[PDB]
Amino acid sequence: CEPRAAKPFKILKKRSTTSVASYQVSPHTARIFKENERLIDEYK
């Protein structure tokens, strides 16, 4: 479960010419996570 080959050529591909605003959680899903955890903790 570890296939290795002699290989004719090696190449490197990259996402380069562009950049994007980085990750942030949405308010919508932040609310859902908070409510979940506050409710889970309220049965316990």
């Binding site: 010419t17 562009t18 942030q24 919508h28």
Partner: protein, 145 residues
């Protein structure tokens, strides 16, 4: 009370993003990517068409919007209750979400040119969509010769 609703919200989230992820994978498997190059505008066109291919099958709208001239900025932000705030976020290169899960605005830059990937939906768009739609922009770049 607060529990039945939250349960429907969890359920909706899991269904929706399972479905959207099913679609994404199906398209990566069966739909050819059309790659435009030669200039900033060709590149921006190809990214716009790719986003549209996916959003079209997912119950949300995606667009690539110029975000260079003040006219570009005002066009984008007049659809919003606090335009000055929306603009400052975008100008400072951060994602903007509405509080209600209907708009995601994602600053995006091709070489020297500024854009904003606009995602909207009649149901819901979140950071999951940020992740999927930015993933696609990365796949686009990787597919270039």
């Amino acid at each position: 009370t607060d529990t039945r609703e939250i349960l429907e919200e969890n359920n909706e989230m899991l269904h929706m993003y399972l479905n959207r992820l099913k679609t994404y994978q199906y398209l990566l498997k069966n739909e050819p990517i059309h790659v435009y190059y030669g200039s900033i505008d060709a590149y921006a066109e190809g990214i716009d068409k790719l986003l549209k291919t996916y959003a079209d099958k997912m119950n949300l709208t995606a667009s690539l919007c110029h975000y260079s001239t003040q006219a570009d900025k005002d066009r984008l932000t007049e659809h919003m209750d606090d335009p000055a705030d929306v603009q400052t976020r975008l100008d400072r290169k951060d994602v903007y979400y509405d509080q209600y899960g209907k708009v995601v605005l994602i600053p995006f830059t091709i070489e020297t040119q500024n854009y904003v990937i606009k995602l909207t939906s009649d149901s819901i768009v979140t950071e999951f969509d940020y992740l999927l739609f930015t993933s696609l922009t990365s796949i686009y770049d990787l597919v270039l010769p």
